[PDB]
Design a protein around this ligand. Sequence first.
Ligand code: BCB
Ligand code: BCB
Ligand code: BCB
Ligand SMILES: C/C=C1/c2cc3[nH]c4c(c3C)C(=O)[C@H](C(=O)OC)c4c3nc(cc4[nH]c(cc(n2)[C@@H]1C)c(C(C)=O)c4C)[C@@H](C)[C@@H]3CCC(=O)OC/C=C(/C)CCC[C@H](C)CCC[C@H](C)CCCC(C)C
Ligand SMILES: C/C=C1/c2cc3[nH]c4c(c3C)C(=O)[C@H](C(=O)OC)c4c3nc(cc4[nH]c(cc(n2)[C@@H]1C)c(C(C)=O)c4C)[C@@H](C)[C@@H]3CCC(=O)OC/C=C(\C)CCC[C@H](C)CCC[C@H](C)CCCC(C)C
Ligand SMILES: CC(C)=CCC/C(C)=C/CC/C(C)=C/CC/C(C)=C/CC/C(C)=C/CC/C(C)=C/CC/C(C)=C/CC1=C(C)C(=O)c2ccccc2C1=O
Ligand code: HEC
Ligand code: HEC
Ligand code: HEC
Ligand code: HEC
Ligand SMILES: CC(C)=CCC/C(C)=C/C=C/C(C)=C/C=C/C(C)=C/C=C\C=C(C)\C=C\C=C(/C)CC/C=C(/C)CCCC(C)C
Ligand SMILES: CCCCCCCCCCCC[N+](C)(C)[O-]
Ligand SMILES: CCCCCCCCCCCC[N+](C)(C)[O-]
Ligand SMILES: CCCCCCCCCCCC[N+](C)(C)[O-]
Ligand SMILES: [Fe+3]
Lengths: 332, 323, 258, 273
Amino acid sequence: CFEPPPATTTQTGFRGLSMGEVLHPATVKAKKERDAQYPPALAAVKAEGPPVSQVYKNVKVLGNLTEAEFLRTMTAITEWVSPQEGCTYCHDENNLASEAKYPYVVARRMLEMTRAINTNWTQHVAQTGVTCYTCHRGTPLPPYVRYLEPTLPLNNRETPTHVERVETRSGYVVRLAKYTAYSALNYDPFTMFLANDKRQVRVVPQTALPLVGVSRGKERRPLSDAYATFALMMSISDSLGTNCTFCHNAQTFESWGKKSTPQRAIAWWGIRMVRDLNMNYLAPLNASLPASRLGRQGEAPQADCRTCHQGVTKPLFGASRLKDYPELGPIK
Amino acid sequence: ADYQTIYTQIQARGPHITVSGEWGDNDRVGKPFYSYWLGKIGDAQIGPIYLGASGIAAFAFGSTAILIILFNMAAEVHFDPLQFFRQFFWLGLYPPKAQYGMGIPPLHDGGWWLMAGLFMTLSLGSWWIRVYSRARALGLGTHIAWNFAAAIFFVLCIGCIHPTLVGSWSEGVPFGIWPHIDWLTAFSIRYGNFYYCPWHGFSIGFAYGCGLLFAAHGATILAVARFGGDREIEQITDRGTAVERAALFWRWTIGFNATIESVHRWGWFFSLMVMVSASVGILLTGTFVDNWYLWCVKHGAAPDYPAYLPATPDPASLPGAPK
Amino acid sequence: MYHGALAQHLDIAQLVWYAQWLVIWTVVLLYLRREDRREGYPLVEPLGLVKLAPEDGQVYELPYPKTFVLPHGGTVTVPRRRPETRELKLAQTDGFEGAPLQPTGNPLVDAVGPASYAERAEVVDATVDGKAKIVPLRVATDFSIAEGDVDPRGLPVVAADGVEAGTVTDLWVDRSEHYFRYLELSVAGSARTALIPLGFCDVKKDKIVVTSILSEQFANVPRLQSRDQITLREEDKVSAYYAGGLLYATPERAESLL
Amino acid sequence: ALLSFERKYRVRGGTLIGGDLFDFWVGPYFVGFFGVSAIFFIFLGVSLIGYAASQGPTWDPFAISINPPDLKYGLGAAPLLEGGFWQAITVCALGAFISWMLREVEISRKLGIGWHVPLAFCVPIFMFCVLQVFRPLLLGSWGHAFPYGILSHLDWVNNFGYQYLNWHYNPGHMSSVSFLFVNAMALGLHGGLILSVANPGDGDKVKTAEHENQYFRDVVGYSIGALSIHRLGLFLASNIFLTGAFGTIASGPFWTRGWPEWWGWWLDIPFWS
Ligand code: BCB
Ligand code: BCB
Ligand code: BCB
Ligand SMILES: C/C=C1/c2cc3[nH]c4c(c3C)C(=O)[C@H](C(=O)OC)c4c3nc(cc4[nH]c(cc(n2)[C@@H]1C)c(C(C)=O)c4C)[C@@H](C)[C@@H]3CCC(=O)OC/C=C(/C)CCC[C@H](C)CCC[C@H](C)CCCC(C)C
Ligand SMILES: C/C=C1/c2cc3[nH]c4c(c3C)C(=O)[C@H](C(=O)OC)c4c3nc(cc4[nH]c(cc(n2)[C@@H]1C)c(C(C)=O)c4C)[C@@H](C)[C@@H]3CCC(=O)OC/C=C(\C)CCC[C@H](C)CCC[C@H](C)CCCC(C)C
Ligand SMILES: CC(C)=CCC/C(C)=C/CC/C(C)=C/CC/C(C)=C/CC/C(C)=C/CC/C(C)=C/CC/C(C)=C/CC1=C(C)C(=O)c2ccccc2C1=O
Ligand code: HEC
Ligand code: HEC
Ligand code: HEC
Ligand code: HEC
Ligand SMILES: CC(C)=CCC/C(C)=C/C=C/C(C)=C/C=C/C(C)=C/C=C\C=C(C)\C=C\C=C(/C)CC/C=C(/C)CCCC(C)C
Ligand SMILES: CCCCCCCCCCCC[N+](C)(C)[O-]
Ligand SMILES: CCCCCCCCCCCC[N+](C)(C)[O-]
Ligand SMILES: CCCCCCCCCCCC[N+](C)(C)[O-]
Ligand SMILES: [Fe+3]
């Protein structure tokens, strides 16, 4: 039922406003240990010999690396994505230039996506960056992805209940609730807001009085947009293991300036980045995936805030490998 | 200590009294029975109950509304009885999610909600008639009915008057445990934080005052139960030492006092004002104010605070930012 | 353009704000606070001598009289002139305006301070249909003690000093509300009866404990006019008597507890 | 000066401390020792509010705000301008409230009535302590307490709630809200009823105790009775804070997640998961 004291608390607004984090140490420790499994950087290698564009036969992304540099990458990729499966997950034992296994082609696009993240989305990932490990955590299927309908459990490494299974219709409300921090909000924030750029998150008017011409009847946004934004915010908070005051002074959710923390701006960039990733890198990959990876509408698994963050306000508590693997970005 | 104020030490039994009303004396059904444990903290007699036309009409319409809600709820769990009990709190009947304006919504998107709203409203009106006419039948003033009227009026405000004034049924209160709760935040978020709505403030002021008054009034009467202060009607018409001491306790404490009758006017007025203030607030919201916080800023009332972590510009307004 | 805007930086909600305060203060000041004054007004000063004309504020603070049509005949009008006639056996402890008064005699018999009774009608409170409301069980023979509960009839009454002071002979019940309000008891060694409000009674299974007065003080409990019914003023006299004991039964009860 | 019936009650005695020294009235007000301590604390607190408010940005009453210290000062004294004034004012508040309660017991003793009213007044004093003292002790800073300002204290209630994503799902809150609602409803019913019996209108005659019970038996099939509704009303009102205090104390010290998630004890039973 309850969590024993003490609680760790932080301050994120002026004194007296009750803004800041409330954290259970046990829970933080369990997440710290889970995230400390991040494999350490492989030892640096001397840049020696010709570029692998001249040495190997089918190297389209990593072509400016030397042989030892490139094989160091391939070791790191195997550690991050398929340590249990090994190099043969993506490769033919007898022909390392064969694209015959689908993980090869996907991994190539993932290489491009990852460098895109570290080069074009520094407004969100800063100097910390991502690697394949950030999402994959040592398995080819990342533990936290989303379909065009809610699935349970959130961690696909756990085995679903009959009711949790997406085909059991009697369990839909619970599948939806657990994605919105157990609220009864009747909206799926992922397909509404993170799958594409079609919907506006902001719903609150920016004037005191209602403007004539947007304020009556069918000119009005339905109230459901406000439910939906709230649902997105429940989901976002739960995905970072935090509460609203991490980003907002609830005195005025819609105001910036002194009424928002810098984390709110970073979160804003995060919404745009996730949209780019899903629309332009992850959703097109239903062409290249087996039918057992796709959802009930032939969609590929896509990313939300939890995919990288897994319940922590900084993924892997700020761990970085950017300086150790320049080939993953940023790219000049 | 006066143990009588905690519970009845020695209970009494006697023949059941029936005060005759101008009509309906035969529509009292049931046989009275007595509960000894109830009788410790209250009156031991349960029943009979009057059973007029308006009361049955209320039960009729109410059950219809309940049934429409429960059926839609069960549809939400594909009629699995076990998941229905599990998920009961999270199940609901929703007004339209899409913007149809004031057009009648499809049954699958708000029509059933509108239906359940109609029958609940009829049930409330029917019960109101019961509350009113029962008073006149027994030769009593209609004070309760006018308080109850304000409470019904507030429900109509959040249920359909405010939707029709802004012109969208999408703004009604859903039916269900958690979902009617969720509406409060969706609404407050839409209209710019309800803490900054002065009529929220008024309503809360009166609601808190109802707690203050009933704690204070209840405590006062119990403190003068030894002189019979609970027999309030005859203390109104013939002031006894009970109400003299009650009046002097307050006068010597706060500097002024009520009478045994006027304290009930105070209480009645405070109760009424919870609902009247709430209704003015909803009637103004959406029709004439869009963001209550900005409205308080416009009129120079909102507090401001220093930044703690750095002030943060809206990134969407920086040059070259994506949409 | 804006819904709710008016000329020169006014909006409708701003006006309603003012109106709402005006409504509140009107009801509170001009209505409720005058209703509050239908008892005990006009106030009493160190002699209000101006018999020729009333002072203006005393007229302004009062509501128009209202008349209650009583259920068994009669009318009461409030507010009205009701000075307290009876001589009070109290003396001013000082010259200051709000210095306390001191009892000169025995305050329980003299009915001052917490022992004071109100001057209610010397009238028996009545049921809907005219009968006496508060009657002992010997008269109210269709009323019983509920099965479960001590029948106190026969039990002794122990006073504050631990002395048995009498024996409970009957319970008086409210026939309108089905609720016992007094015990009747014979005071031992005095050949009379006394009534006790239940609220002063600790009903145990072998005794009735009564901490408000001493055993000897049961002798001077106000007596009733009739044996089998009580008037509203008598109810006040009886109830007040024990309450006066809370402060007066012993010299130490009026002084500070610390 | 005095109500027509007041003089016979204006007797000596009933104090808790000081005997005759403070046993007197000033106008309608009884004084007593706690009258004196109350005025002391009120004067001190209002002075500190005034001094603190003048060192602040504005004089608009809606925007003045005396705030507690930053969390980093833990449970220690903080500099006057940045939390100290809040600390001082808080102590005056507690002095004033407790004095006020104890003054009411003295008034109760003199009149020979029950102490029920100061008893009831303990509940809101207790709730104030839950918010400003006990819960900040359990968390380790006075910084978690609420600020003194007409509108600013609402911003604290606001953010405090959203620190647990949706406070409405707090079970102690649900209980508290339910008592606030039913208490306001009962007071309307009780006041409505009494007025309806004494004021039938039309020169009709005033009704009776039996009419009171007949009305509620007729409408809802039960009537709790005259004395009992007053006991129930005190019970209902008191439980607004008595049950609410658990939902407040729990948040932070005994629960750090959102309050909706707390209901997983029900939703996630394996039997129907
Ligand atoms: C946990 C949640 C709380 C809360 C949540 C809350 C909300 C959500 C709202 C209020 C509102 C109010 N609160 Mg607040 N509050 C207040 C006082 C107030 C008033 C400004 C106002 C109406 C109160 C009322 O009518 O009650 C009933 C009592 C009555 C009717 C008797 C009259 C009391 C009088 C009107 C109070 C005036 C007090 C003075 C302004 C302050 C004292 C000044 C000094 C210098 C003498 C005090 C004095 C305290 C203390 C000492 O704890 C307190 C604590 C809390 N409030 C907690 C922090 N309160 C409302 C408001 O409009 O604020 C702007 C409002 O909407
Ligand atoms: C984040 C969102 C919040 C919010 C959102 C909110 C909204 C949107 C509205 C309120 C309203 C109100 N809020 Mg507020 N609120 C309140 C208190 C209050 C109430 C005093 C007031 C009136 C509601 C009421 O009494 O309904 C209880 C009584 C009701 C609902 C009447 C029911 C009567 C009916 C006849 C009953 C009959 C039922 C049938 C028997 C059953 C049949 C059913 C079947 C057929 C299905 C406090 C004390 C606080 C604190 C401490 O923070 C707070 C904070 C919040 N409120 C946050 C700001 N609140 C109302 C208001 O005043 O707005 C100006 C309002 O409209
Ligand atoms: C977004 C955040 C929200 C929120 C956050 C919230 C928090 C954080 C807390 C509450 C609490 C409470 N909320 Mg809740 N809330 C409530 C109702 C309530 C109250 C019933 C309850 C107790 C308030 C309290 O502690 O007063 C405090 C009042 C006090 C202490 C009175 C002190 C008086 C003092 C002894 C004397 C003062 C004297 C003056 C200074 C003297 C001046 C007088 C002059 C005239 C001379 C309603 C009805 C609603 C609706 C309709 O939505 C609502 C929504 C919300 N609440 C939003 C969801 N609420 C409290 C609770 O119980 O939670 C379980 C609480 O801690
Ligand atoms: C500030 C003003 C307050 C206020 C005022 C007032 N509120 C009143 C009156 C006043 C003056 C009445 O005169 C009337 C009444 O009659 O009281 C005895 C009444 C009402 N307020 C109810 C509920 C409510 N008030 C709420 C709030 C506020 N109100 C605000 C706070 C809330 C909240 C907070 O959500 C709720 C849920 C119902 C009990 C009742 C209507 C039943 C009905 O409309 O029928 C609807 C028809 C049905 C079939 C529903 C059946 C179930 C219900 C519980 C009815 C069952 C009764 C039945 C007799 C049981 C038999 C038992 C028997 C076998 C032993
Ligand atoms: C469930 C229990 C209920 C309940 C019960 C009862 N309520 C009682 C009694 C009972 C039984 C009394 O016997 C007593 C009284 O006599 O009635 C006239 C009283 C009283 N209830 C008051 C206020 C009240 N009740 C509230 C709530 C409930 N009550 C709940 C609902 C609320 C809110 C917010 O809800 C308020 C504001 C005062 C009017 C009065 C105390 C006067 C005082 O204490 O004098 C002493 C103090 C002063 C005169 C001023 C002191 C100034 C300090 C030093 C400096 C200010 C500091 C302050 C903290 C700053 C705050 C700023 C602000 C904007 C944040
Ligand atoms: C200057 C100096 C040295 C003075 C010394 C003396 C001294 C200690 C003075 C104190 C000065 C102070 C601090 C005064 C402030 C007084 C205060 C706190 C007033 C608060 C008033 C408020 C807002 C009350 C809210 C409650 C309210 C709306 C009450 C209105 C209705 C009333 C009067 C209710 C009280 C009341 C109740 C509850 C009954 O049940 C009852 C039953 C039968 C008869 C009368 C009554 C009755 O009067
Ligand atoms: C999927 C996540 C892979 C795992 C595990 C391994 N490799 Fe890989 N490899 C992968 C891709 C998508 C590519 C193409 C790279 C590009 O820039 O286009 C490669 C390439 C190679 C090569 C060069 C082969 C050639 O074209 O001649 C070699 C030699 C190679 N990979 C070796 C290698 C080893 C030894 C691995 C286990 C340590 C390994 N790879 C894992 C995808 C994936
Ligand atoms: C989150 C932003 C990711 C990062 C960074 C990387 N990957 Fe990824 N990958 C991600 C998703 C959501 C998916 C879809 C689920 C799926 O299993 O397809 C994938 C998929 C792959 C695959 C295919 C594996 C399979 O389907 O069995 C491979 C081989 C893969 N990803 C490799 C890979 C590499 C090498 C990465 C770093 C260069 C990398 N991914 C980053 C999410 C994310
Ligand atoms: C940071 C990681 C956040 C947390 C935790 C919460 N919110 Fe949020 N919110 C955040 C951003 C970046 C934005 C802007 C979205 C955009 O695309 O522009 C928002 C927006 C809102 C809004 C809408 C405000 C408007 O202008 O209409 C609301 C009402 C809101 N947020 C509320 C809210 C609540 C209640 C939260 C805790 C449950 C919450 N947010 C968390 C960033 C972050
Ligand atoms: C991997 C591709 C990510 C996805 C998807 C999302 N985030 Fe992220 N975030 C990521 C990194 C590598 C970092 C850097 C950590 C650091 O040390 O700077 C972040 C940072 C944030 C922050 C800043 C938190 C802070 O303490 O300063 C926030 C508020 C944040 N992220 C929010 C957020 C949201 C709301 C997302 C979904 C829209 C989201 N992130 C996705 C990596 C990735
Ligand atoms: C002209 C026509 C077509 C349109 C106008 C129709 C009209 C007047 C519509 C009005 C609609 C209104 C007033 C809607 C208001 C709805 C509101 C305020 C709903 C609020 C809360 C609902 C709740 C809590 C319902 C929960 C439902 C359940 C728990 C299932 C029902 C079962 C029950 C046992 C009910 C118990 C409720 C409670 C006593 C515990
Ligand atoms: C809008 C509510 C309409 C409900 C209609 C059904 C109620 C019937 C009223 C009968 C009243 C008869 N009467 C006056 C003798 O009590
Ligand atoms: C609980 C919300 C209370 C907010 C109170 C704000 C009221 C502002 C009214 C302003 C009156 C108009 N004017 C001219 C003085 O600005
Ligand atoms: C926010 C709700 C406002 C409620 C206002 C009720 C306050 C009662 C004022 C009592 C005034 C006393 N007196 C003697 C000056 O009339
Ligand atoms: Fe009463």
